């Protein structure tokens, strides 16, 4: 059983901007994620000061980033708080709409994409490089689920019938035919060196077999 949602109209017209604007800073999706990521282990590691019972579905706090040439995807995985199904359908879009308005305002002065987390609407530069993007996730208070966008106006959530993850977030990029190089190991290390070396968590990069 799969619903169909449309995004918000100026959700759709960022996603829009974002797929067809000529800009070559591609890497910063990966900044974006991992930022994105951090923010969810912040989350549940301070619940679970006052709560220990919220790490009952895990324990370990850290970041997994899974290339895969043959799918040609990129995954990163995190067990950070999670999303419940509200959030993945209301409340996350609510909070983008003021975002994503400022940020395009941001954009009209002059500002330029690489700015896009300091709207809150980072998640979006995954349209950089992917041509579909699936979010698989997992908060306690709710089962798991799958969203899932190819831009277009539109999105899905269906409950999720995979591996159980426990508690955190999947973002799996379905990457464009010309982005392969985000499936390099010594790329994803450049990048993760240049933007993301002060995370505050274990980022493993995954090799290919
Ligand atoms: O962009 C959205 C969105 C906008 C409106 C409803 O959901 N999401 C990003 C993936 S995780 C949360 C859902």
């Given at each position: 059983e799969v619903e169909t949602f449309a995004f918000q109209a100026e959700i759709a017209q960022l996603?829009?901007?974002?797929?067809?604007?000529f800009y070559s800073?591609?890497?910063?999706?990966?900044?974006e994620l991992i930022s994105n990521s951090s923010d969810a282990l912040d989350k549940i590691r301070y619940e679970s000061l006052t709560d220990p019972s919220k790490l009952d579905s895990g324990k370990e706090l850290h970041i997994n980033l899974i290339p895969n040439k043959q799918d040609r995807t990129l995954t990163i995985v995190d067990t950070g708080?999670?999303?419940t199904k509200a959030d993945l359908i209301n409340n996350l879009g609510t909070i983008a709409k003021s975002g994503t308005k400022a940020f395009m305002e941001a954009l009209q002065a002059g500002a330029d994409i690489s700015m896009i987390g300091q709207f809150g609407v980072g998640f979006y530069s995954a349209y950089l490089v992917a041509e579909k993007v699936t979010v698989i996730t997992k908060h306690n208070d709710d089962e798991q689920y799958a969203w899932e966008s190819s831009a277009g106006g539109s999105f899905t959530v269906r409950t999720d019938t995979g591996e159980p993850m426990g508690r955190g977030t999947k973002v799996i990029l379905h990457l464009?035919?010309?982005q392969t190089e985000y499936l390099e190991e010594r790329r994803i290390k450049e990048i993760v060196k240049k933007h993301s070396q002060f995370i505050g968590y274990p980022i493993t990069l995954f090799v290919e077999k």
């Open positions: 996603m829009s901007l974002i797929i067809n604007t800073n591609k890497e910063i999706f990966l900044r708080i999670g999303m464009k035919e010309d």
